């Protein structure tokens, strides 16, 4: 699926609706980013700028002007067309095609922005700007306001009020539209197919990075060229490290592998984690920890719905985990006292959920301790895990284990929808899948 | 293959040999680099810092101190160990293991660099620093020199002389050692296998990005996780655009596809371009242009040797190209006058060769118009191409064609060695390869 | 006279009255300023910071917090006491004496401002800050807002709204209180005594700078140590240059001298200009131009009152000047057409009036073309002048003449009060004064 | 006296003599400096730039180019002429008159410096630049070097070596020429006349600032418009504060007043301190401390000559002071042990001497603990003092006293010459002077 022109227009108007009359909102594009020397990383548009434009060029600025409660218009600054620059550094939209292509009223050359922007802000009361987001943007905005401030003899005046649009825009991004949900739904499928494939390909002797290659290939073949985040393939003791991206080790018969990978599809992130035996057969000890993480996920998926919160559901997960660990002798004592002592923390130190959207760790206000009441349209991850360090003082068989199972959900009128359930997580279903693949 | 500890030591001493007595060289690591929000691109170490250390962390600084012509020592600043930071943002070397792991004399915490660096520079005559390379580095170095300058009452003195080490270091990087050549030799094989695979997989109806996925998979499976540069898959008229990386189009029966992709293997870049029919069968018109580019490459590979230069060989290529284009009626007139008129330029506007190494467009001095005499150990690309715009005023059958064929070579005592010849480029061999694959 | 503690408190409350509830206003002190090497200029406090504090130290910040419509409090950041620093760079107020001395609620060390300021802004909706006023201030404020923005997990939130307090504060400064008027009244007397003295001392053969010395001495002896602006003593052709401060020439019998000097008394600027014959006797040609400037000033002093504007009075001055110049043959033609042609501009190119206060060119909004209706409490200069260039195409006797006569006034309920009329300006009174002095 | 054109040329050549062949030296002018709002401090040229040019404008850059050991030339960047700018912000030299006026070969507009400077540095090996001296200069120089670095395809190359010219230039400034000595000799006379006048004018009831006014007037009347540093008039307990510049107190019968004031004459600083009874009659206790400071000064003036050092002479002063204080009972014990205990430090905590020149605290290397052997041509202050705090644990009669006596000297072939001896310092001569004045 995709995001429509009409949808981009709706979002702009939605922002304008909340703006004060006599104001302008300034949204800047991301800079290009060096990888080494004259070589650059693949371009990634700023998420907020993308959200309002679906325009994948740098050196661009969207300006939304609200004259009053019924009058408003849009100006885009963007790079000019140029036969030289394009033949080299690749084709450009230019000013002519931009109004029609991107549904803006006017389009001006970025190279003129210092000559033109102050004229657009002259006489307004308010400017909305995300200060500190980019250095080049702050320089342009501050330069425009100084010309207005020092220009009373030329009848110029600066807006005295600057407001951060991020709280407003991020509150919008927090609630996904039907179109957005459809896109994320497809990101979930693509990402899941990748994890299914990783499970099917995995053999002892393969290196962790080989599963990374299989996943990225799968993303690509469905049209999601880039991952939403750096892929994790943590086998054995590497599963205990949360930001493990080296993915440099041989995968050994007997170990578990934790794979956290997500595609980026039309800008929107998938985010799945599956953990499984490298040899296709869970051991007793591996099952004992896996079952606790899986019950945490399965209960959380039953619970998540409008009315509850991440905090509340996290409470139930803590309970499930402390009980499970007490039964294994990894913790000793009363469950309720241990909870109050937060005794689960050496083993479960991540949160259960984060917002998901144009960024994998998406924008939006969580509330104190993530107490915010959930409403339909919110999209989030459910990702319980247990991480027992190699030197943890616990029975030997649990040492050096890292297990996480992560699914992506959307809150609905009566519950939630699981976007990533098409890749399996029940242990019998994992072993069946891997067995089935190993006859080929 | 790999780069040894001993080799890293040799390079450091080689630099020290050329430094003035009573001097210190400051080499800084690359900053981490944001992709979107809290998510980061895969880390890419600065090439020069990497060259002297094989150390893949940010917030690190190599300091090489020359007391005199026989006394010198090395200090490394690097991130301290930290159970918190690592469990999250991934394992760190720390100060204890660093001397032995990386062959430096001393290792100090990066968080102490402002308290310690000025003490290392006190009383020296010369500091070698690459000014403007990184903002954070300039701030550290300038801060260290100001403390020394303003500290005469505490018997401190700053070195009065600052020298850019880049000309010196880049002249070293220009000449590859046996180990480096072995690594690049393997980068060439990996990259070539990827291009062979792309040719074998290509069918009409596949999208350009599908061949990108096949190539990146092949890089990965041989242990080259990342490309050295953003992959180009330019089919049809997209072949006319030199920085085409969108790779977003359906590949059509009848069109050519130009694939320029390279792996990064132990830091060193492969760089191959092959152009071929999407349907496995060159047309007369496609053959007519391809044959001119291929003769240019084949002649260049015969010519490149110690004693000649990129400029001189480029001269012979211009000749080959103008003659070929005159025979097709794409140019009219006397070959020699047309050459003097530079009449080939609308169609051949890139250079023939660039240095290759830790950067795809490698460091090192070219000489005026690339006139520098070649010597053994230099590594470079040979990449003639013809690009006929869709609206070029030439016979219709040549319009909208882009063809490049690129190989990587090293200059040897008596000629050159072709690192990328294991992927085919003779047209009959391309058609045979694709035919053979199409029975499967 | 002086400014009371109570008055400083009133101004703070007056600002607070206009602030939004749940807001904080940040007012920064001026940096110290190098003259050459380790030597500094005499310290000049930022005028706005001074206005609210009467505190003459750098590295100080006034923070006014409005909790709601009845609750507000003040925090001062200032330099800590230190026996070392003071014995050297001079005594300091410190935190203990500050609340009581300066009428603030709380006082904290400036060296703690980055550890404390963000805590004062946490949870507010609005911060009032003068962006771009000082680099060090912007760094402190931006640093405080980033900690709040990135600190949601520690339950911090930044104010989303930033407002420039300068329009508000400068509108306050535009209207002087009884105390302020009394201070300016005394600045006027001091400044005038200085000009009277200059006239009495002036002889041919003295250098322009000698009159500067006489003026600065007079300022000093009445307790106004520093001038409000760099003194102008433009004799002969130097009178034609508006920013003449070299004051390096011998004063010649036959020439006029234009003296523009003002004291700074308790922070408030005097600003007087008197022009007079170096030899104490006006010539016919000097009188002819002087009489036009003086009638302009005398008419302006009759006119200035509540209800009119600088623009309107400037209109009447233009009329007076064009008529005067036509009668001398310096302009030819119809007065009304010449006015419309703005034909007076080569000779009268300054404005007639500027606001006067803590800055000689004081803050406050003028309106388009200075059309703002005057109200009681506004303080301003009246300074018509004629400047005929040495090469002006006019009768020889008028070439190379510069004449200005400037007085300071305050608008009152029924007119204006002249603060500087105690130094003479009628030509007969100037000649009498100089004659009287020349018998001594 | 003054500094000649020829002398400015000599200094430039002297610098060039020491420069490497194939190099350029970049010397920048001082920025203009705000006092409050649109008002500026009196302009003070950077001392080093002044030293080579005698040119008193901002936005100017001297560039000295050494082609080889016999070829060199000078380029000046300066502000262009402009009838508008000058009529307002005052006359300018421009490019036409500059070569001849200031003895440079070529002169270009400052507004072109970014278009022209890199062309002057292209192909040189060395650039001499004072990094960190001014922000605007670093921006210009770094911008010029980046164009050269990134411009190999346009056959540009940057100098790889940057050297600080300050050690070289400051070593030149350390040794004064005959002309410089003549100028300083006159600065000494002017400054001394000012101090004599202060002594003659001083009466109880006058404020400290009144003596400041008398001194500044005297400076001015001899053509030294500005002081070299902020004047100190510390009466009573204010004498104990070294950086006392408030000068705000009533001078009381019975107290001493310490006056430290210096003129700036043709750029060169005078620096004299005299301390004397406000009522013209020293008391026993005042005499007891004064006599120790005066013997320190008189012995130092006998001692200072080529061959000795500030450190060595400071040794003899410490001896004189500890003995004097022991005889008064302000210190108890063995003189030699007390010296070794540095027991004099609570009372004598300043140094004895600093270099004097274009800056009051002049440039030049002191050596460790100021051990540098003195040579003819060095100019320095001799300024012993005793400062007994109001709460010092000493006999009551010595509490709250500050006494310093400072003279300026030049080292000669056989000793020194005292530039400031024309103002008196023997106590009987002070009392005679004040008595004589008090009959008038
Ligand atoms: Mg185990
Ligand atoms: Mg065609
Ligand atoms: Mg005349
Ligand atoms: Mg006493
Ligand atoms: Mn994840
Ligand atoms: Mn997640
Ligand atoms: Mn290539
Ligand atoms: Mn290439
Ligand atoms: Mn004035
Ligand atoms: Mn004025
Ligand atoms: Mn002094
Ligand atoms: Mn001194």
Determine the residue of chain C that is closest to D249 in CA distance. Answer: C223
What's the Cα-to-Cα distance from C341 to each of B351, C335, C337, rounded to whole Å? 63, 10, 6
C223 touches chain D (CB under 8 A): yes
Substitution target in A35, A217, A361 with the highest count of B β-carbons within 10 Å is A35
Three-class SS state of C202: coil
Cα B247 to Cα B236: distance, rounded to the nearest angstrom: 11
Given the DSSP bridges, would you call strands C72-78 and C106-109 parallel, antiparallel or unpaired? Answer: parallel
Q: B93 CA to middle of ligand 1, Å?
A: 25
D246 touches chain C (CB under 8 A): yes
DSSP code at position C399: T
The answer to whether the beta carbons of residues D39 and D148 sit under 8 Å apart is no
Which residues have C-beta within 8 Å of that of residue B203, sequence separation ≥ 6? B251, B278
Of D209, D359, D387, the CB nearest to C37: D359
Which residues have C-beta within 8 Å of that of residue B236, sequence separation ≥ 6? B249, B252, B255, B256, B257, B400
Show which subunits contact B, needing at least 3 CB pairs below 8 angstroms: A, D
B245 touches chain A (CB under 8 A): yes
| Nearest-CA distance B49 → chain A (Å) | 12
Written in H, E and C, the secondary structure of chain B is: CCCCHHHHHHHHHHHHHHCCCCEEEEEECCCCCEEECCEECCCCCCHHHHHHHCCCCCCCEEEEEECCCCCEEEEEEECCCCHHHHHHHCCCCCCCCHHHHHCCCEEEEHHHHHHHHHHHHCCCCEEEECCCCCHHHHHHHHHHHHHHHCCHHHCCCCCCEEECCHHHHHHHHHCCCHHHHHHHHHHHHHHHHHHHHHHHHCCECEEHHHHHHHHHHHHHHCCCCCECCCCEEEEHHHHHCCCCCCCCCECCCCCEEEEEECEEECCEECCEEEEEECCCCCCHHHHHHHHHHHHHHHHHHHHCCCCCCHHHHHHHHHHHHHHHHHHCCCCCCCHHHHHHCCCCCCCCCCCCCCECCCCCCCCCCCCHHHCCCCCCCCEEEECCEEEECCCCCCCHHHCCEEEECEEEEEECCCCEEECCCCCCCCHHHHHHHHHHHCCC
| Residues annotated within a binding site of D for Mn(2+) | 260, 271, 354, 383, 406
Which residues have C-beta within 8 Å of that of residue D217, sequence separation ≥ 6? C213, C214, C216, C217
Q: Is C305 exposed, middle or buried (0-12, 13-18, 19+ CB in 10 A)?
A: middle
Determine the residue of chain A that is closest to C364 in CA distance. Answer: A152
The answer to whether the beta carbons of residues C208 and C234 sit under 8 Å apart is yes
Q: D134 CA to middle of ligand 10, Å?
A: 32
Of A30, A39, A225, the CB nearest to B360: A39
Continuous segment of H or E residues that includes residue C77: strand C72-78
Q: Do D225 and C242 touch (CB under 8 A)?
A: no
Determine the residue of chain C that is closest to A154 in CA distance. Answer: C368
Determine the residue of chain B that is closest to D147 in CA distance. Answer: B132
- Token pair of D171, please? 């070593």
| Nearest-CA distance D157 → chain B (Å) | 11
Q: D80 CA to middle of ligand 10, Å?
A: 28
Cα C356 to Cα D35: distance, rounded to the nearest angstrom: 16
How many beta-carbon contacts under 8 Å exist across C and D?
A: 120
Q: Go through B316-325 and write b for each residue having 16 or more CB atoms within 10 A of its CB, e for each that does not.
A: bbbbbbbbbb
Ligand nearest to the CA of B261: 7
> Which residues of chain C have a CB within 8 Å of the CB of D223?
207, 209
Show which subunits contact A, needing at least 3 CB pairs below 8 angstroms: B, C
Q: Do C164 and A158 touch (CB under 8 A)?
A: yes
| Nearest-CA distance A202 → chain B (Å) | 13
Q: Do D160 and B158 touch (CB under 8 A)?
A: no
Q: Do D360 and C39 touch (CB under 8 A)?
A: yes
Experimental technique for the deposited model = X-ray
Q: What are phi and psi of D175, to 5 degrees?
A: -105, 115
Domains assigned to chain C: 1-173 (3.40.350.10), 174-440 (3.90.230.10)
The candidate with the shortest Cα–Cα distance to B253, out of B64, B438, B28, B36, is B438
> Which residues of chain B have a CB within 8 Å of the CB of A360?
39
D289 touches chain B (CB under 8 A): no
Three-class SS state of D239: helix
Ligand nearest to the CA of A359: 6
Three-class SS state of C173: helix
Resolution in Å, one decimal place: 2.6
Q: Go through A140-150 and write b for each residue having 16 or more CB atoms within 10 A of its CB, e for each that does not.
A: bbeebbebbbe
| Nearest-CA distance C20 → chain D (Å) | 27
Q: Do A132 and C152 touch (CB under 8 A)?
A: no
Q: D279 CA to middle of ligand 12, Å?
A: 26
Q: Do D361 and C39 touch (CB under 8 A)?
A: yes
| Nearest-CA distance D9 → chain C (Å) | 23
A243 touches chain B (CB under 8 A): yes
| Nearest-CA distance B347 → chain A (Å) | 12
Q: A347 CA to middle of ligand 7, Å?
A: 48
What residues flank ion ligand 9 with Cβ within 5 A?
C 260, 271, 273, 406
Q: Helix and strand tally (H, E) in chain C?
A: 13, 18
Three-class SS state of C236: helix
The answer to whether the beta carbons of residues B165 and B129 sit under 8 Å apart is yes
Q: Do B46 and A33 touch (CB under 8 A)?
A: no
Ligand nearest to the CA of D395: 4
Helix axes B208-221, B178-201, angle to 10 degrees: 140
> Which residues of chain B have a CB within 8 Å of the CB of A39?
228-230, 359-361
| Nearest-CA distance A309 → chain C (Å) | 16
Q: Do C39 and D89 touch (CB under 8 A)?
A: no
Of A149, A164, A368, the CB nearest to C160: A164
Ligand nearest to the CA of A405: 5
Q: Is A383 annotated as a binding residue?
A: yes
Determine the residue of chain A that is closest to B226 in CA distance. Answer: A213
> Which residues of chain B have a CB within 8 Å of the CB of A230?
39-40, 42
Look-up of token digits 């020397």: A37
Cα D49 to Cα D47: distance, rounded to the nearest angstrom: 6
Written in H, E and C, the secondary structure of chain A is: CCCCHHHHHHHHHHHHHHCCCCEEEEEECCCCCEEECCEECCCCCCHHHHHHHCCCCCCCEEEEEECCCCCEEEEEEECCCCHHHHHHHCCCCCCCCHHHHHCCCEEEEHHHHHHHHHHHHCCCCEEEECCCCCHHHHHHHHHHHHHHHCCHHHCCCCCCEEECCHHHHHHHHHCCCHHHHHHHHHHHHHHHHHHHHHHHHCCECEEHHHHHHHHHHHHHHCCCCCECCCCEEEEHHHHHCCCCCCCCCECCCCCEEEEEECEEECCEECCEEEEEECCCCCCHHHHHHHHHHHHHHHHHHHHCCCCCCHHHHHHHHHHHHHHHHHHCCCCCCCHHHHHHCCCCCCCCCCCCCCECCCCCCCCCCCCHHHCCCCCCCCEEEECCEEEECCCCCCCHHHCCEEEECEEEEEECCCCEEECCCCCCCCHHHHHHHHHHHCCC
Q: Is A68 annotated as a binding residue?
A: no
Cα C436 to Cα C280: distance, rounded to the nearest angstrom: 10
Q: Do A361 and B39 touch (CB under 8 A)?
A: yes
Q: Do A243 and B38 touch (CB under 8 A)?
A: no
What's the Cα-to-Cα distance from A407 to each of A195, A199, D319, rounded to whole Å? 12, 16, 84
Of A145, A160, A368, the CB nearest to C167: A160
Q: Which of residues 354-393 of C touch D (CB under 8 A)?
A: 358-361, 363, 387
Of A132, A161, A162, the CB nearest to C142: A132
Beta bridge partners of D223: none
What residues flank ion ligand 11 with Cβ within 5 A?
D 260, 271, 273, 406
> Which residues of chain A have a CB within 8 Å of the CB of B223?
207, 209
């Amino acid at each position: 699926s995709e995001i429509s022109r009409q949808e981009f227009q709706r979002r702009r108007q939605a922002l304008v609706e909340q703006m004060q009359p006599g104001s302008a909102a300034l949204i800047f594009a991301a800079p290009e980013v060096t990888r080494s020397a004259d070589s650059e990383y693949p371009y990634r548009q700023n998420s907020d700028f993308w959200y309002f434009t679906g325009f994948n060029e740098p050196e661009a600025v969207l300006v939304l002007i609200k004259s009053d409660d019924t009058h408003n218009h849009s100006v885009l600054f963007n790079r000019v067309r140029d036969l030289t620059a394009e033949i080299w550094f690749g084709r450009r939209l230019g000013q002519d095609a931009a109004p029609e292509k991107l549904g803006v009223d006017r389009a001006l050359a970025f190279s003129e922005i210092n000559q033109q922007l102050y004229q657009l802000l002259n006489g307004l009361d308010v400017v909305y700007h995300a200060q500190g987001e980019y250095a080049y943007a702050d320089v342009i905005v501050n330069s425009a306001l100084e010309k207005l401030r020092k220009g009373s003899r030329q009848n110029l005046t600066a807006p005295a009020t600057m407001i951060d649009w991020r709280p407003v825009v991020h509150e919008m991004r927090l609630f996904k539209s039907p179109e957005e949900i459809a896109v994320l739904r497809r990101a979930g499928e693509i990402t899941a197919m990748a994890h299914t494939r990783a499970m099917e390909k995995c053999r002892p002797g393969m290196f962790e990075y080989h599963l990374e290659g299989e996943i990225h290939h799968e993303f690509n073949r469905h049209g999601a060229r880039y991952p939403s985040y750096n892929t994790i393939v943590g086998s054995g003791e590497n599963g205990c490290i949360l930001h493990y991206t080296e993915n440099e080790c041989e995968m050994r018969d007997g170990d578990l592998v934790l794979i956290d990978a997500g595609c980026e599809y039309k800008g929107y992130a998938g985010d799945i984690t599956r953990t499984f035996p490298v040899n296709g057969k869970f051991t007793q000890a591996q099952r004992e920890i896996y079952d606790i993480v899986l019950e945490s996920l399965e209960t959380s998926l039953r619970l998540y719905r409008p009315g509850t919160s991440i905090l509340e559901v996290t409470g139930e997960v803590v309970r499930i985990m402390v009980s499970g660990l007490v039964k294994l002798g990894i913790l000793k004592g009363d469950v309720d006292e241990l909870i109050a002592q937060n005794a689960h923390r050496p083993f479960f130190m991540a949160g259960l959920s984060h917002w998901l959207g144009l960024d994998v760790h998406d924008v939006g206000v969580y509330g104190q301790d993530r107490s915010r009441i959930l409403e339909p349209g919110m999209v989030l991850t459910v990702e319980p895990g247990l991480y027992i360090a190699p030197d943890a003082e616990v029975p030997e068989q649990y040492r050096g284990i890292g297990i996480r199972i992560e699914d992506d959900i959307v809150i609905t009128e009566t519950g939630n929808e699981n976007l990533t359930a098409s890749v399996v997580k029940k242990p019998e279903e994992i072993e069946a899948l891997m067995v089935a693949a190993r006859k080929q």
